Amino acid sequence: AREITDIKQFLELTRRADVKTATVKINKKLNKAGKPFRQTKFKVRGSSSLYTLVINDAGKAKKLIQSLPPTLKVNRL
Amino acid sequence: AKRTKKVGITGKYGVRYGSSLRRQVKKLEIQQHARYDCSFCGKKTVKRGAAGIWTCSCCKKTVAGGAYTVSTAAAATVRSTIRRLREMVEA
Amino acid sequence: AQRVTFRRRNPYNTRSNKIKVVKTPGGILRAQHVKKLATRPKCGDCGSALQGISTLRPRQYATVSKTHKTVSRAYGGSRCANCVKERIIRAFLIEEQKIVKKVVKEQTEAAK
Amino acid sequence: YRDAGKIDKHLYHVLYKESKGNAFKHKRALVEHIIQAKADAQREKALNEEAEA
Amino acid sequence: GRGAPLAKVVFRDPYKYRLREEIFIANEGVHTGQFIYAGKKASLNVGNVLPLGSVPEGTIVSNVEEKPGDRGALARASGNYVIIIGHNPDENKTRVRLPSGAKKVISSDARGVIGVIAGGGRVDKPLLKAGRAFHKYRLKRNSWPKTRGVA
RNA sequence: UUCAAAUGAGAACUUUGAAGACUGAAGUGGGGAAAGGUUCCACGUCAACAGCAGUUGGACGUGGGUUAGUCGAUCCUAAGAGAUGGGGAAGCUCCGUUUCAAAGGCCUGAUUUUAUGCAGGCCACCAUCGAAAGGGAAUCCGGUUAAGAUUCCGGAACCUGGAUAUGGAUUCUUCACGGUAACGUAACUGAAUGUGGAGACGUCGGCGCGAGCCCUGGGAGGAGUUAUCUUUUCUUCUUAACAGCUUAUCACCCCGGAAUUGGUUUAUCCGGAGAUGGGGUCUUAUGGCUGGAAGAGGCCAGCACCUUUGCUGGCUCCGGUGCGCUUGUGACGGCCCGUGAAAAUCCACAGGAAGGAAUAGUUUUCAUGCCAGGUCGUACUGAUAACCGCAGCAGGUCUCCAAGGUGAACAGCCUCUAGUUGAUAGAAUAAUGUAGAUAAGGGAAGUCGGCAAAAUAGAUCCGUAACUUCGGGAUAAGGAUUGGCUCUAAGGGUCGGGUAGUGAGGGCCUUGGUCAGACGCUUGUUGUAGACGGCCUUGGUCUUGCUACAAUUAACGAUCAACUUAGAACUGGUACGGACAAGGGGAAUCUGACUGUCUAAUUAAAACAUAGCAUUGCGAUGGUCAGAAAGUGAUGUUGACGCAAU
RNA sequence: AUGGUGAACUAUGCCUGAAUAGGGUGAAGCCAGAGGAAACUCUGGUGGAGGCUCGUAGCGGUUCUGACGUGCAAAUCGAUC
């Protein structure tokens, strides 16, 4: 579906009582004219749409991945 | 540079259709495709679309007229007859 | 160069059978059917296309929100600004002259 | 050259009409033709200043 | 199939709240947005339709009614008109000159629209090609080409 | 067409492998419409058919195979068909289909036996059928069978019908604000009735732009050649429906005001009914980034599995040009005594009925959530073997895609992808034949008649008469060149119009780190980088506003990639449109003016037709014509510049 | 003579769609220049018209009175059109 780029609202739709599954994807991409980095994508499967949240810095990944509720069945990689 | 001597627009028909028929056709197509002045805006923007319909490109004012002329000579006096006949009703 | 074929069952090219060839992810050239083009809505008075209104097929207009179907003017999605602007002039001035017609009539007949 | 500022608005129209026709054959053919037009304009302009004085 | 332009005149229904469109043969000299007036008290201008009994001598009209209510039968082609050549107040008749030169007397109550019909002088252009005849007759009827009976 | 192997009792024909060719992408290739009806695929098999043969088959016996809310039929209506009420007709039935028919349902309210009746506001359309290439609500990608897929598996969408809430906006200025404006903001009451838009749309010509393909540079891999040379040749490098942001001509809005008239398209239209200019709005075709989605597909290296198979892995990148072909679209211009469809359906506006506030009532044409999408078709051929021509018969049958080179070219000729290598064969290869050809000298003397063949026949330069309806005749007639190599000249785009102090050198790399400097290489051990990066620097760190010299001319300098034209030397046993491709010409006569049409299967014609000219009838209670009548029709959705007969 | 069937071929009209490489010639209209006192006339560009023209796809078929004429074919094949 579409893509949303806000952290705070993203957690709201995780426990929105309609999301059953979610997936996380890792990509090793390039940037600018320098050395590459670690890139990750967080995907959430809704009832009629497939939301996503791309993050190009693994620094913010830690505090978010722990914030996922245990009741959410996550397909790691 | 006058490219063609005497046939102009009707020269597109080649050599066929005689000389008088082309010439008589030639006369009408000159004013059929010509540019007329508009009575509502006064511009050189009156052209013929369809048989006897004269439209103005600007202000979209379409005037009904002759098949090949905005105002045919056989009917220019018709409104002159009516207009001269109107005033006797009042005075 | 790869060559494509029809996906529907009609073998003839018409306005309802327009074909655009697209580069498919699988590495092959696939024919993609295009729907007929939309036409701009037109003003009822001047006939010209009116701006600010979404252009789409007739039946599919039932899905778009009103923000693309109604400008905040009087005669929103039927007339276009200038036609409305002089429609106000024609309405205001003729009613203005109508009472002028009335006042002269009340004076001439009274002094008759 | 019209927006370059060196030329005037009126001389644009003269050459534009002629460029729609002939006697302008190529890019080079126009450039000194423009120059001599400015050179001619500068000729009487210099002579007009001294003649008045 | 008609050499004369039409006119789409809208008349507001007085009986009910709606609009009625009418198809009129465009008399030459009428334009879009012109106020076409129909009735007894209509003035004498090109485009208006009036009964023949309401107009003085010398007026030429078109699209007149054979009988009071057939809504126009006579002088409907391009460039045609019928002249008012005298009234008959007794027994409410009026006689006119048809475009063919025939003189016919009709009721003064039958209506007719003032002015000649646009599209006149059309047949002054030679038809030249066969295809121009084919194009002209492709919309009128199957009356072309004509084969001689002697052959 | 040939060779070898395999199978088989039995191979010029089956299969496989190796060669040699052809169709040359207006296919001998990929899909379909009508038609066929299981010919589709698998097993086994040769009595019969495949005009030779055959273990081969579109044949024989037995089985398998066609998956739809989105593709279509379903629905609308065109030309037209036709049922009622009616009128004829002995009658089978004929006329008309809205016309001499009192021909219908429909929202509010009543509610609380009213089930749905009843009391008012109402509108009147006025059977049905009729175009799987006319209009039409909604989806794509990857993969998967012996045979299926836009239908199945996976992933990702959107539409319609319905029910209910959650969230947001609205409100004691009870049914929103902003912008001068074009208009915008996800939502941001609203009936009867009326109006408007879409559906809805001619052909041709050039131009602009987009997509697919073609050409090509760098780099990352694989395959080919390598007697000699070639930073060489070929090949993979791809991204969908749908969604967010963003993006164009055209058009419009605010200021301003014009002659020393100016903008301006390849194509001269526009401007005091207000330009040029400055600043904005809008449709979003198309295009760009992102999500779908790189975990998908593709090209490669190792692992070993009689096997059922996979794992580990790398890349899947950055560009350029063009009168290039196909196609789409936009603003235009030319054409008409042709100006070049309807309805279903969908939406909007005017209007104001009706109801409504905050102790909350709406808001289900705002976001989200829940359910369902019925029936029918889906296999294959679509053609010198699946259709029609009694047959597997050189015949006929509608359409989309279409590469490289020479070349004006979808012409001819050769090739890449793909597909065939199929239509009886072997040996000598007499006459006579059918189809291609060549002939010394003359040359139409042959023949009813140069009938058949022949010659010129492409391109560039020169030159062209009689006559004429002045447009043509006319590439008339008639002359000069054409190869290859090395050069010369000409025809464009994009950038830059200074020095000294100054501010940012919004890259500020650089020295210190401050602390997001963190992931990455189960708590902790203590080990690694901090992604070397947000945040401040004493700085050497090619765009500039200010002043100065004086700022200007000559115009310059740097990059880039196309073909076209002309010319100069040299060179070839004077050959050069070298193959293919490709006009014989002139003086006249008879006749039809020309384009066009017909005897589909012996006559393509001076025959018919055509424009032009003239005549005749007709003013509708009519002229011409049809019907067995009719309350019937064709001209006629007509009117004398028209219809009808010549 | 009576009563029925046939326009899937072809004959004509209507509705609905579909198809037509590449060159030649050059009309209006327009622009510039020149001439002249005017009227106006010539020169050079665009421009694409034209039931025009050479010529493929397509439609017919002129000639060889070619081939065949118990044929591939109850009229087809090849060249020239």
Give the Å distances, CA to CA, from C15 to C11, C30, C40, E66.
13, 19, 18, 49
Nearest CA distance, B52 vs chain E (angstrom): 5
Q: What gap in Å lies between CA E46 and CA E59, rounded to an integer?
A: 10
**E-state strands within chain B:** 46-48, 53-56, 63-64
* Contact status, residue E93 vs residue E107, Cβ threshold 8 Å: yes
CA-nearest residue to B53 within chain E is E5
Q: What gap in Å lies between CA D24 and CA D28, rounded to an integer?
A: 9
Count other C-beta atoms under 10 Å from residue A61's C-beta.
Answer: 16
Nucleic strand F near CB of residue E74 (< 7 Å): yes
Please give the method by which this entry was determined.
cryo-EM
Classified as helix, coil or strand, C55 is: coil
- Say yes or no for a CB contact (<8 Å) between E4 and B75: no
What's the Rg (C-alpha) of chain D? 13
Cis status, amide bond into E51, omega within 30 of 0: no
- The stretches of E65-115 forming alpha helices (DSSP H) are none
User: Which of C38-45's residues contact partners 24+ apart within 8 Å by CB, and which partners?
Assistant: C41/C77, C43/C78, C43/C79, C43/C80, C43/C83, C44/C78, C44/C79, C44/C83, C45/C79, C45/C83, C45/C87
- The residue behind tokens 């017609």 is C101
φ/ψ of B86, rounded to 5, equals -75, -40
- Strand F proximity: list residues 35-94 of C with CB under 7 Å: 35-44, 47-63, 65-82
Nucleotides of G under 7 A from a protein CB: 12-14, 17-19, 26-33, 41-47, 49-52
* Contact status, residue E34 vs residue E45, Cβ threshold 8 Å: no
One-letter amino acid at A64 equals L
- Strand F proximity: list residues 28-57 of B with CB under 7 Å: 29, 32-33, 35, 40-45, 49-51, 57
- Say yes or no for a CB contact (<8 Å) between B68 and E45: no
**Taking CB atoms and an 8 Å cut-off, how many pairs form between chains B and E?**
113
Q: Which residues contact B38 (CB under 8 A, 6 or more apart)?
A: B45, B46, B56, B58, B59, B61, B63
Q: What gap in Å lies between CA B53 and CA B66, rounded to an integer?
A: 8
Amino acid E9 CA to nucleotide G38 C1' distance, rounded Å: 53
Q: Angle at which helices D27-52 and D9-20 pack, to 10 degrees? A: 140
Nearest CA distance, B68 vs chain E (angstrom): 7
B chain contacts of residue E43, beta-carbon cutoff 8 Å: 86
Locate breaks in chain C with C to N over 2.5 A; list the residue preceding each.
Answer: none
Q: Which residues contact B13 (CB under 8 A, 6 or more apart)?
A: B22, B25, E128
* Contact status, residue E25 vs residue E47, Cβ threshold 8 Å: no
Cα first-last separation, chain C: 95
φ/ψ of E125, rounded to 5, equals -95, 120
User: How many residues does the structure list for chain B?
Assistant: 91
Closest C-alpha among B69, B72, B73, B66 to residue B31 = B69
Read out DSSP for C62-94? GTS-GGGT--SSTTTTTS-THHHHHHHHHHHHH
Q: What gap in Å lies between CA E90 and CA E99, rounded to an integer?
A: 25
> What does the buried/exposed string (b/e) look like for E101-140 if buried means 16 or more CB atoms within 10 Å of the residue's CB?
eeeeebbbbbbbbbbbbbbbbbeebbebeeeeeeeeeeee
Classified as helix, coil or strand, C2 is: coil
Virtual torsion, Cα E69, E72, E73, E78, nearest 10 deg: 180
Cα first-last separation, chain E: 30
Q: What is the DSSP letter of B8?
A: G
User: Which of A29-37's residues contact partners 24+ apart within 8 Å by CB, and which partners?
Assistant: A31/A56
* Contact status, residue E98 vs residue E80, Cβ threshold 8 Å: no
Give the Å distances, CA to CA, from B34 to B44, B68, E4.
9, 10, 20
Amino acid B25 CA to nucleotide F549 C1' distance, rounded Å: 76
Q: Which residues of B touch E (CB under 8 A)?
A: 13, 17, 21, 24-25, 28, 40, 50-53, 60-69, 71-72, 74-75, 78-79, 81-82, 85-86, 88-89
* Contact status, residue C19 vs residue C13, Cβ threshold 8 Å: yes
Nearest CA distance, B74 vs chain E (angstrom): 8
- The residue behind tokens 């409305």 is C84
Q: What is the resolution of this structure in A?
A: 3.2
Q: What is the DSSP letter of E116?
A: P
| Cα angle: B50, vertex E8, E84; to 5 degrees | 90
What's the Rg (C-alpha) of chain C? 27
Cα first-last separation, chain A: 20
Give the Å distances, CA to CA, from D18 to B44, D13, D28, D31, D34.
25, 9, 15, 14, 12
Residue E72: HSE in the Cβ half-sphere, 13 Å Cα cutoff: 16
φ/ψ bin of D18: left (φ > 0), alpha (ψ from -120 to 50), beta (otherwise): alpha
E chain contacts of residue B77, beta-carbon cutoff 8 Å: none
What's the Rg (C-alpha) of chain B? 18
Q: What gap in Å lies between CA D34 and CA D12, rounded to an integer?
A: 10
**E-state strands within A1-77:** 21-27, 39-45, 50-55, 73-75
